[PDB]
């Protein structure tokens with residue numbers, strides 16, 4: 001169908017918004033700052049994790065102003081490497097647009113950038129985690145990650161290769177496209193403990209959403 005092709009060359013307020021001045025609270029141990037949303041000279045979204053106060057942490061999230069439905073989502077990215085942090089790409093609808101909570105994820109646990117974590121939420125329920133081995137260290141360069149979201153399945157790919165398939169209670173509300181980098185608290189078993197290492201950066205080259 002129709003193709004949304006976002007090359008992330010500069011901030012376009014019509015299509016994107018920078019989260020700012022707040023914290024998601026919970027496992028999220030940092031405050032979203034618009035100042036942490038940058039663009040490189042060669043057109044990369046540069047998400048930055050800083051400490052602008054002794055044990056205070058500044059993090060970053062970029063998200064779509066519009067909403068999207070079924071189809072192919074691809075991203076070319078380069079995650080941060082560190083204990084206690086997540087770099088991600090996901091779809092998201094919750095009460096955000098006064099609905100139930102539906103979500104599709106691609107998460108890189110900074111403690112082990114040699115792996116990826118797939119997962120999804122359907123009406124607030126998750127626990128669909130799937131960890132796969134990359135065969136490479138994600139943090140060294142840009143690679144291509146995607147999910148094909150249709151009404152009866154989700155399919156995850158890496159550099160073009162089917163890695164995972166999900167068939168049950170597949171989400172169905174449309175949602176926004178989101179990218180964020182953050183340090184977790186009291187999920188250590190999951191993310192490892194964050195040692196305050198900073199600044200940390202996650203990089204995005206482009207996003208493409210292909211409808212139908």
Ligand SMILES: [Ca+2]
Pocket residue numbers: 007008009042043044204205206
């Ligand atoms: Ca680009």
